[PDB]
Write a protein that binds this ligand. Structure first.
Ligand SMILES: Cc1c(Oc2ccccc2OCCn2ccc(=O)[nH]c2=O)cc(CC2CC2)c2ccc(C#N)cc12
Lengths: 401, 547
């Protein structure tokens, strides 16, 4: 009910990001939504004296046909001053289950600092540039802005104070417009407790971190090896030697002596079996000296494995993986690679939010134009991470398969 | 006197840390001075400007060309940034046919909208006196000055705010604002349409805005932004292609711009051979001859531009179709239409600057471009007709290491068809010979060797001059492809060669890569395997090529 002054970083002007084209149905949905919000005072129209702009588009979240309004506040977020910190809950990732709630509506009750409102301007575009776009700015705390949770932290703490005092075994975390609730109950008791918390938030996405861990490097176990089998094995072990110190491949390369056919069976010598066993024992241990640095960026790499299978690695230093995984979920994206990649980006980003409380920078195996053309059609999250595009096919593909 | 409605001003400020302009006034001839005194006298009579005292320290130069012209370049440098919604013009192919159409220009556009009074003191200018024997006459603007940075945006926003209620209470008509003109269209009967035009100019008159009282000075066909708009169709204004036996870089730029302009309705325009000459630009004066490909290309451009072609208007009740054809040398042509041989518009796409490429990737990029253009113009993605079999696309995207997607499309059997020219095996081949390849080069002498040793005892080492490591690795693979049967397993350590081949090109700028592609096309089965170098892997002989 009282506005807190908000400013920008020194020497930085407001965002001036071009609005990209939208389909007619998304434009109509945003027209209806923004009209309703204008009748409720959440946004107000602006004149040409406001040169700032932030992209906007429309989505449809899970299990809902209602269009939702999504603002790409990335540029404004990184141009907004740093708000200060609550240490990340290191036990949220250790809990048995976590449920994500959309507490975005609660932001619309808190007014926004007047002098800052000119920086949240956005444009509903028109088809074929026929008429001028409909320009708005926010009067209250907008969803997607990084200052909205920072400002609401006191109010949110006051709201959840009884629930936190009631169940000390339930971890509560907040990121952007989402509230993460970790516990160890039963799925039924979990859902009933979530209904209790959502009505507790009313009067004022099952995710199990235990079923996801880190993945070791595994070598084949065969009774007969071909020249090709041993060539691939030596390639993979040589690659893993960048990660593990003691990997050696000389006794296995000694078997390849000569110009043999690739399909010819080669029996393993005893020295070769010994070297392979030592390499197994080395791979069974974790990686040497792998730490998380909150001052550094998180990098995520995604490889397409085919047949709807995808691998990913989150690291900070090359060969120092903080997390690895393999998203192979099939949910109505059998014939669309971009939809699969987008859902994978969303899941990986969510995991990254749970573990470290921030999003990673993605390296996407897709051409810039395809992704930029289609990614908003399958996006369902309220946040947006950063991404770049790898254009050279990496060789370490099958080494993660 | 009927009370006119007020137009609320737009608060304007200067850029932060800057002050108003202070530019010395130019010396003018006595004739020019008298002319400016008459003009500014009538203007002050009309209320556009007002005399100011000596307190105002800001000044803007003025000239007479009689017509008064104020040079606001410094104030434009010192004025804040505005939001201009004129970023890209509407395309005629996006318009929808209307039975009746009317153009209403707004006379005295910027001179009918008031200026923020706190900002008027920055628009001060002086008229020099005769012989400079008296103080020059000081004036400031009360309305939007033409040539000032903020006039278009403020005028457009004010006009929008005025037009909102009339458009709200008239859903059966369509109104467009553009610069100093309004364009109104409706499918009503001509009498009812003219009536609603009278109501519209009355509603604009309630705010003090005038329209053409006579028969509207512009009737079809309308000439606008290089376009011809007709009652039933649209096209581009006739082209003007200069012909001179000595061409410059600037003339090549103008010719390229004009051909690209004509390509939006004339299908089949090609501009590659003329655009290749723009390498090494920034020198507008030059004499660049043309090759036979460029001369035949421009001759074909005159051949297509020989007879006029028209485009139709958009009908939302019918499907939107876009069809693509391959032209060769990275060139692609497309047509967007709703009924056969009645194009909404046309266009072309040229492949990006790259070392290697294939036709499927280029077709994908053209599809993305057409999709974005279609979302701009019509707000939807069209259905595609593509010269590529469903199975070919299936194999491509299922085996491609990158993620890719094409929206809803169907196969059209119009040669040349896009196809996959080779497919590498996933597992080694039984019964096929195994070629262990290797190459190496001396960094100083540029001398190298490339060759192979196989499981059947076949061997070859070839010496090479003026080469590199990468070239000798590619050369080695190529030697194995030349001397092997229709089925071959190949073992290399070249991460470079594997990087090139795993990108699946069907055409390259490197002749060696193209010869490799031609060899792969002739093969029944090829399995390419990679091993680490210098790891004592028997077979892979780095020492055989290092001699
Ligand atoms: C009359 C007019 C424009 O006219 C229209 C105004 C309102 C709705 C549809 C309109 O045209 C639809 C297509 N069309 C076009 C011409 C014609 O005779 N009949 C017709 O059905 C639309 C634009 C498109 C641009 C403004 C958006 C114009 C642009 C320039 C000029 C001139 N001079 C006139 C314009």
């Amino acid at each position: 009910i009282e506005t807190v002054p908000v400013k920008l970083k020194p020497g930085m002007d407001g965002p001036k990001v071009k609005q990209w084209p939208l389909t007619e149905e998304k434009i109509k949905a945003l027209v209806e939504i923004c009209t309703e919000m204008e009748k409720e005072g959440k946004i107000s129209k602006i004149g040409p004296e406001n040169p700032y702009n932030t992209p906007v588009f429309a989505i449809k979240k899970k299990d809902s046909t209602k269009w939702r309004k999504l603002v790409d506040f990335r540029e404004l977020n990184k141009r907004t001053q740093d708000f200060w910190g609550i240490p990340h809950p290191a036990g949220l990732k250790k809990k048995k289950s976590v449920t994500v709630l959309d507490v975005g509506d609660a932001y619309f009750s808190v007014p926004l600092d007047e002098d800052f409102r000119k920086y949240t301007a956005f444009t509903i575009p028109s088809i074929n540039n026929e008429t001028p776009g409909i320009r708005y700015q926010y009067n209250v705390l907008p969803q997607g802005w990084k200052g909205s949770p920072a400002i609401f932290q006191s109010s949110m703490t006051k709201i959840l104070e009884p629930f936190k005092k009631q169940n000390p075994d339930i971890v509560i975390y907040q990121y952007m417009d989402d509230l993460y609730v970790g516990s160890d109950l039963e799925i039924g008791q979990h859902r009933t407790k979530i209904e209790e918390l959502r009505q507790h938030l009313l009067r004022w996405y099952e995710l199990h971190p235990d079923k996801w861990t880190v993945q070791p490097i595994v070598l084949p176990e065969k009774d007969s090896w071909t020249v090709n089998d041993i060539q691939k094995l030596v390639g993979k072990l040589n690659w893993a030697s960048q990660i593990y110190p003691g990997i050696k491949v000389r006794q296995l390369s000694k078997l390849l002596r000569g110009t043999k056919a690739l399909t010819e069976v080669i029996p393993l010598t005893e020295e070769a079996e010994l070297e392979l066993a030592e390499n197994r024992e080395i791979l069974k241990e974790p990686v040497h000296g792998v730490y998380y640095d909150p001052s550094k960026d998180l990098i995520a790499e995604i490889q397409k494995q085919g047949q709807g299978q995808w691998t990913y690695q989150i690291y900070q230093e090359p060969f120092k993986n903080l997390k690895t995984g393999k998203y192979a979920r099939m949910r109505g994206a059998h014939t669309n690679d971009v939809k699969q990649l987008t859902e994978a980006v969303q899941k990986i980003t969510t995991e990254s939010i749970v573990i470290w409380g921030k999003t990673p920078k993605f390296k996407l195996p897709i051409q810039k134009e395809t992704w930029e053309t289609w990614w908003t059609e399958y996006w369902q999250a309220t946040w947006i991470p950063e991404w770049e595009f790898v254009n050279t096919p990496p060789l370490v593909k099958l080494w993660y398969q | 006197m009927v009370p006119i409605s007020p137009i609320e001003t737009v608060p304007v400020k200067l850029k932060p840390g800057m002050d108003g302009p202070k530019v010395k006034q130019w010396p003018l001839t006595e004739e020019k001075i008298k002319a400016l005194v008459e003009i500014c006298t009538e203007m002050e009579k009309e209320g556009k400007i007002s005399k100011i005292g000596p307190e105002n320290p800001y000044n803007t130069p003025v000239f007479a060309i009689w017509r008064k012209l104020v040079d606001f370049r410094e104030l434009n440098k010192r004025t804040q940034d505005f939001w201009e919604v004129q970023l890209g013009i509407p395309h005629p192919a996006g318009l929808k046919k209307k039975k009746s159409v009317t153009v209403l220009d707004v006379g005295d556009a910027y001179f009918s909208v008031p200026l923020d009074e706190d900002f008027r003191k920055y628009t001060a200018f002086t008229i020099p006196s005769i012989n400079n024997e008296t103080p020059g006459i000081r004036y400031q603007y009360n309305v939007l000055p033409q040539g000032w940075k903020g006039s278009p945006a403020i005028f457009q926003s004010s006009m929008t705010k005025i037009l909102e209620p009339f458009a709200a209470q008239n859903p059966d008509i369509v109104i467009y604002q553009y610069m100093d003109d309004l364009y109104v269209g409706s499918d009503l009967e001509i009498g009812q349409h003219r009536t609603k035009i009278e109501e519209l100019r009355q509603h604009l008159l309630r705010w003090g805005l005038t329209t053409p009282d006579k028969k509207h000075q512009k009737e079809p066909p309308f000439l606008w932004m290089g376009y011809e708009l007709h009652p039933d169709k649209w096209t581009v204004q006739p082209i003007v292609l200069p012909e001179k036996d000595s061409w410059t870089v600037n003339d090549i730029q103008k010719l390229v711009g004009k051909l690209n302009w004509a390509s939006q309705i004339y299908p089949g325009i090609k501009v590659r051979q003329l655009s290749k000459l723009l390498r090494g630009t920034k020198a507008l004066t030059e004499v660049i001859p043309l090759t036979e490909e460029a001369e035949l290309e421009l001759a074909e451009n005159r051949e297509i531009l020989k007879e006029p072609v028209h485009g139709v208007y958009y009908d939302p009740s019918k499907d939107l179709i876009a069809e693509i054809q391959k032209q060769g040398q990275g060139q692609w042509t497309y047509q967007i239409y709703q009924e056969p041989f009645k194009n909404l518009k046309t266009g072309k796409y040229a492949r990006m600057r790259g070392a290697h490429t294939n036709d499927v990737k280029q077709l994908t990029e053209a599809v993305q471009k057409i999709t974005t253009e279609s979302i701009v113009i019509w707000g939807k993605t069209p259905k595609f007709k593509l010269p590529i079999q469903k199975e070919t696309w299936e194999t491509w995207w299922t085996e491609y290491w990158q993620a890719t997607w094409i929206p809803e499309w169907e196969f059209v059997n119009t040669p040349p068809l896009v196809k996959l020219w080779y497919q590498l095996e996933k597992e080694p081949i039984v019964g096929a010979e195994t070629f262990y390849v290797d190459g190496a080069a001396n960094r100083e002498t540029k001398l190298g060797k490339a060759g192979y040793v196989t499981n059947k005892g076949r061997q070859k080492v070839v010496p090479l001059t003026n080469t590199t490591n990468q070239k000798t690795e590619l050369q080695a693979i190529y030697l194995a492809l030349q001397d092997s049967g229709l089925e071959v397993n190949i073992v290399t350590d070249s991460q470079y060669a594997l990087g090139i081949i795993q990108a699946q090109p069907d055409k390259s700028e490197s002749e060696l890569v193209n010869q490799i592609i031609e060899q792969l096309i002739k093969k029944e089965k090829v399995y390419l395997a990679w091993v680490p170098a210098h790891k004592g892997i028997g077979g892979n002989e780095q020492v055989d090529k290092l001699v």
